[PDB]
Amino acid sequence: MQIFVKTLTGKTITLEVEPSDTIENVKAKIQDKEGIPPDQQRLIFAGKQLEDGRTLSDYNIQKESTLHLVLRLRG
């Protein structure tokens, strides 16, 4: 399948992942596409901040379903 990710800078990335793909590997692919480490990544699917230790199928995310990305900048 294929989904989309809307970032905090307005850019909507197009990503290709498996239905059983873990959120950690999704953040790794986002790091590949952009360069944002998983340290500053928090993914949201309709208001609910996703957990790293889960998969896309658990949140019932179909193909072409957009996920929001929020940066958790430390410092």
């Binding site: 905090l8 800078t9 952009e34 360069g35 944002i36 928090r42 949201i44 208001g47 609910k48 901040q49 230790g53 929001h68 929020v70 940066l71 958790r72 900048l73 430390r74 410092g75």
Partner: protein
């Protein structure tokens, strides 16, 4: 996977997002970080050693770091204000969103990846923060080019 704020003694209620507990006109999804409603009064926590964010906010809002830290103690549980992350990596932008809600402003963070907004849009004050990837993230006032 386990969370310290789940059984935090300085907070009451269950785990809810910050936007549900204190709703405003935050930037889209920038307030979805989970927290809990503060129960006990200010424990008088010490000023965090990694206090770059507090200095950056103080240079813009003219509010002393002490008052900002006390307001953070009144809004947030202790387990999310001074923990292993606070003393190693430092403060997060979630504290910046909490301070923006408490003091009514929309901070503009000029990070290495571009400009981001944090805090309610239904405000007047607009502060500017410069974010450095470093390592690690360094917080300063103003913007850069």
């Amino acid at each position: 996977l386990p969370a310290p704020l789940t059984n935090d003694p300085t907070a009451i209620g269950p785990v809810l997002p910050f936007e549900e507990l204190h709703p405003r006109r935050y930037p889209e999804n920038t307030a979805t970080f989970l927290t809990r409603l503060r129960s006990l009064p200010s424990n008088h926590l010490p000023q965090p050693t990694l206090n770059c964010l507090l200095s950056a906010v103080s240079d813009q809002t003219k509010v002393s770091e002490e008052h900002l830290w006390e307001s953070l103690q009144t809004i947030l549980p202790d387990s999310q204000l001074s923990n292993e992350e606070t003393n190693t990596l430092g403060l997060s932008t979630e504290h910046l969103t909490a301070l923006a809600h408490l003091y009514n402003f929309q901070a503009t963070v000029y990070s290495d990846r571009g400009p981001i907004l944090f805090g309610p849009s239904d405000t007047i004050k607009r502060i500017d923060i410069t974010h450095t990837t470093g390592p690690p993230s360094h917080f300063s006032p103003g913007k850069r080019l």
